[PDB]
Amino acid sequence: RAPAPYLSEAQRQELAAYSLKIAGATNYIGAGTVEYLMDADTGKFYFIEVNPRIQVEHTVTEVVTGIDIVKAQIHILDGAAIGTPQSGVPNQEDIRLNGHALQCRVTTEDPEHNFIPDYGRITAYRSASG
Amino acid sequence: RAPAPYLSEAQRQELAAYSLKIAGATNYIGAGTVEYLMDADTGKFYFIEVNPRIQVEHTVTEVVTGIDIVKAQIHILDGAAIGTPQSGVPNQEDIRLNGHALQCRVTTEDPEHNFIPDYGRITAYRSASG
Ligand SMILES: [Mg+2]
Ligand SMILES: [Mg+2]
Ligand SMILES: [Mg+2]
Ligand SMILES: [Mg+2]
Description:
This is part of a larger assembly, with 2 copies of chain A.
Chain A: H1 9-25, E1 33-38, E2 45-51, H2 58-65, H3 69-77, E3 109-110, E4 116-117
Bound molecules: magnesium ion (4 copies).
């Protein structure tokens, strides 16, 4: 889910500051994810690790921010500066949340058969959009 | 296309003010479109007609405003007030443009046969998203 719906605006800015600290400290190039565990009892955050790559769940962030993370990666490696139009990335002050998103992966894991993936011929596939 | 890319902000707001006048004067209920001709040589606008219904091109407007027109039609006819969360519609001050969109209708009209629509069984259909 993006953003995390149980966070206050304060917790949201707290986490963002920690992540910029980590990214700067490692002179990070490209897209990466800084992972925390939050103690639901206390509200405390604890850094766990950095995933130094794009992730399967990037899509929820693209939809609520409007920023294509893959084109951003390509422009960054072409030498573009974040905040210039040719980077595809706004300056921080122009990055905003717009709404909420969730994402799910649909698989052939059969819930009625202990999540063993099913296999074989798909006889019909019609997606739903809108 | 939404918004109209050849317009300035000032033009955009002039047009909005005319449209709100028409809507209010007709006590309009639901979704409607106020259509204008704009003279490309002078920048002058001219009211042509109101289309008193949703239109095929509503989709570009939805994507750049974030507002579901069809849900809004439904809440409005349920009696909701625009501006309340129940209406699915923000107050005017909270309605804003976010980026740019265009819509293309894919049809069986054959450019190789004077746009006569083709017909028959579709043997393969795979859309593209992202
Ligand atoms: Mg991890
Ligand atoms: Mg890991
Ligand atoms: Mg017309
Ligand atoms: Mg007409």
